[PDB]
Request: fold
Amino acid sequence: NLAPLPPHVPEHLVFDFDMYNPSNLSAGVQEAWAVLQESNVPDLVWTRCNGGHWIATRGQLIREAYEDYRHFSSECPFIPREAGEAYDFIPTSMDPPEQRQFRALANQVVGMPVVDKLENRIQELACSLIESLRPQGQCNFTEDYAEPFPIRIFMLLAGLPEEDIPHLKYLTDQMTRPDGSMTFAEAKEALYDYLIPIIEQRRQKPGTDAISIVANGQVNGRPITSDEAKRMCGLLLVGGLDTVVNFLSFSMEFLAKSPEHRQELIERPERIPAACEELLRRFSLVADGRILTSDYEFHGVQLKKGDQILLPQMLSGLDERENACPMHVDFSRQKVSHTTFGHGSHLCLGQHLARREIIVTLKEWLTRIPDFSIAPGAQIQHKSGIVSGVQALPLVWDPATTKAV
Ligand code: HEM
Reply:
């Protein structure tokens, strides 16, 4: 299902890549996207898939475009166009300087200070979940840890009942990895209908939870509106429910296949932070974009106003020009270059929370379950979209090789 090639786009720049169903997905989602970095592919190409849009394939261009919000606006940051136009989350649908004050408020509820304060609960939950699974000798990692660990921490931060997780997780996933069951707008609206009642309650009887803080915050020297709080909380729900949740599975899948890397972190724990960064590079998973504010010649390519351009955060770190032997995991890389958490004015505010959750998981999991692997004959499948993920990850291990703390 390709859209007619626009007049201004040269045929030699055409490369029909589908970000929601890459042809080489069976080899791994990152590998599937890396086909865009083969020698036969230009640095900047146009795909006729998903309505038609540009795709920057090199880290240099991706970074450049994310810095130049003047030409590349966040007003319509998602592909397809229908999703990008319906998307109105704050601050991700705003350009500087309008995003400034909202970004500051969001930083108040998920910033480093909050993460350091919540570290004890994060550690507590990781240890509890892992210790419960340890003597079982098996688990379905996605539903047994990848999901409950980051999600319960977020629901605690936001003061939301855990009973609502199933409902919320379904909706956030419809936005990032569309099922065709409902439009982007419908999923977004459902999320808003859930928040509206809560925000109204929190504005009346304020609490100390993340939603209360956002709902009663100040922006531009004045009170934040019910609508703006809703648009901010919508983004927080996606960050809490569909980011780290997916990344942990890519990382655990790799570790299950690499005894050498597991042993490495076990005897050299101080390398965990660096391992976290290298895994964030190798298993990068986000891909959003921008919209051209006007006609513009970018690196010899003529872009037209209204054109959408995908700037895959995932691709920068896999670019061989940024990291030699990009598909190889090396915890000792002199410089782990990547844009996994974004680049520019919208650099992820939850990156500190994400790193803390990843580092705690690596340390606590390897301590109790140092030796494990993917279930026999199990064929792991990945899924692609705005945020990519792992369908299922069955792991197995000899309980006799585990350690209780
Ligand atoms: C491994 C996990 C994560 C990854 C890879 C990630 C990635 C990103 C990226 C690439 C952006 C920028 C998008 C753009 O430029 O349009 C972003 C923005 C953002 N992220 Fe995350 N994120 C993660 C986890 C989280 C978590 C756990 C939270 C909080 C609950 C969070 C909150 C935010 C917020 C609030 C923004 C908007 C910043 C702004 O617009 O100024 N993220 N994230």
The chain has one domain: 1-405. The longest strand covers residues 288-292. The pocket of protoporphyrin IX containing FE is lined by residues 74, 77, 91-92, 99, 103, 106, 110, 154, 235-236, 239-240, 243-244, 247, 286, 288, 313, 340-342, 346, 348-350, 353-354 (CB under 6 Å). The radius of gyration is 21 Å.
